[PDB]
Design a protein around this ligand. Structure first.
Ligand SMILES: OC[C@H]1O[C@H](OC[C@H]2NC[C@@H](O)[C@@H](O)[C@@H]2O)[C@@H](O)[C@@H](O)[C@@H]1O
Length: 332
């Protein structure tokens, strides 16, 4: 019941049933940022897929539709007016998953149309020899936070439609990103800036979408190198994006990064499942599972009286993005 309890508490604290959006924090003065709301959307989907309580499962299934409706009410159905390609892609990926769960074709259309806008018009072969631009306004940087999510979205679209166009896209985007946005040993770089070069700053959410795309490509292609890529980036996370006791870092003060453990945990769950299914990397798998279980217990040892867990897992206004990671962790 821990995943159920966590999700119910998160909803009670942060869901606004009127606006059909999550509040940014418990002061209930402002709703969550657009791109972060796609990640909270996916959290609802993950709880839906995790729960064995059929009553809660039905409520969460309805909430999947409600989140979309609330966002569309405030932001439109056509997100291509947003200058951030990442914002667009986070919602395209979410929409693909919503289609898988609900079978409502509005979600497939949303996913496909927005994926196609970004991939078809924002890929460039010249600067850095490939990659998708961060923005559709100015073209100055190519970033992990658009490129790996784009590969993931393409993989969901391939799973749904089997259009070889999408498998080819995932393969090409990931190949470029491994080459230009990693060190080849699992450290994922933030971005590559024109007139400067790479910015080798690593964070949980970019480790996470690299790992998820790698695991997806391993499954789609049967090429073990992709699983090796995922394992290296999981090892880098476990050893180098943790505190002196092995607890995943708190990545404040940047608001976007504070909740990044949410996206990391989502994708580490995919790696765990693949390792469990295949029996590959058994020694790593054992250490990895113990370290995850440790992190989750530490997080939840710090829940407050309302069963809300602040994003400082190692340690009075609770924020929905920072608090989501602990919920995600119990809904893998
Ligand atoms: O340490 C990683 C980066 O963290 C901060 O940027 C967060 C986020 N901002 C938008 C876009 O630049 C993303 O690629 C990025 O992850 C910021 O301090 C960066 O300088 C830093 O590299």
């Amino acid at each position: 019941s821990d995943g159920d309890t966590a999700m119910k508490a998160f909803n009670d604290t942060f869901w606004d049933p009127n606006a059909k959006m999550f509040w940014k924090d418990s002061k209930r003065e402002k709703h969550q940022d657009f791109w972060v709301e796609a990640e909270l959307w996916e959290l609802v989907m993950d709880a839906y897929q995790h729960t064995s309580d059929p009553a809660l499962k039905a409520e969460l299934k309805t909430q999947i539709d409600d989140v979309y409706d609330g966002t569309v009410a405030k932001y439109g159905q056509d997100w291509t007016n947003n200058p951030f390609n990442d914002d667009i892609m986070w919602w395209a990926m979410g929409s693909a998953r919503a289609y898988q769960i609900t079978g409502n074709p509005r979600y497939l259309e949303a996913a496909r149309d927005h994926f196609d806008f970004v991939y078809d018009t924002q890929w460039d072969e010249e600067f850095a020899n490939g990659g998708i631009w961060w923005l559709n306004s100015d073209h100055n940087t190519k970033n992990a936070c658009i490129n790996f999510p784009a590969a993931q979205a393409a993989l969901y679209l391939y799973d749904i439609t089997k259009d070889e166009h999408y498998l080819n896209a995932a393969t090409k985007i990931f190949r470029w990103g491994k080459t230009m946005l990693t060190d080849g040993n699992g450290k994922v770089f933030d971005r590559i800036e024109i007139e400067h070069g790479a910015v080798p700053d690593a964070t949980h959410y970019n480790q996470g979408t690299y790992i998820g795309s790698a695991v997806g490509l391993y499954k789609a292609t049967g090429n073990a190198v992709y699983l090796d890529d995922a394992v290296k980036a999981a090892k880098f996370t476990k050893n180098h994006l943790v505190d002196s006791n092995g607890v995943l870092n708190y990545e404040g003060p940047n608001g976007d990064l504070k909740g990044g453990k949410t996206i990391l945990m989502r994708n580490l769950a995919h790696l765990q499942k693949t390792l469990d299914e295949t029996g590959q990397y058994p020694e790593f798998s054992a250490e990895f599972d113990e370290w995850l279980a440790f992190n989750i217990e530490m997080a939840w040892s710090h829940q407050n009286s309302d069963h809300i867990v602040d994003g400082n897992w190692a340690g009075g206004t609770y924020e929905s993005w920072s608090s989501a990671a602990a919920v995600q962790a119990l809904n893998g």
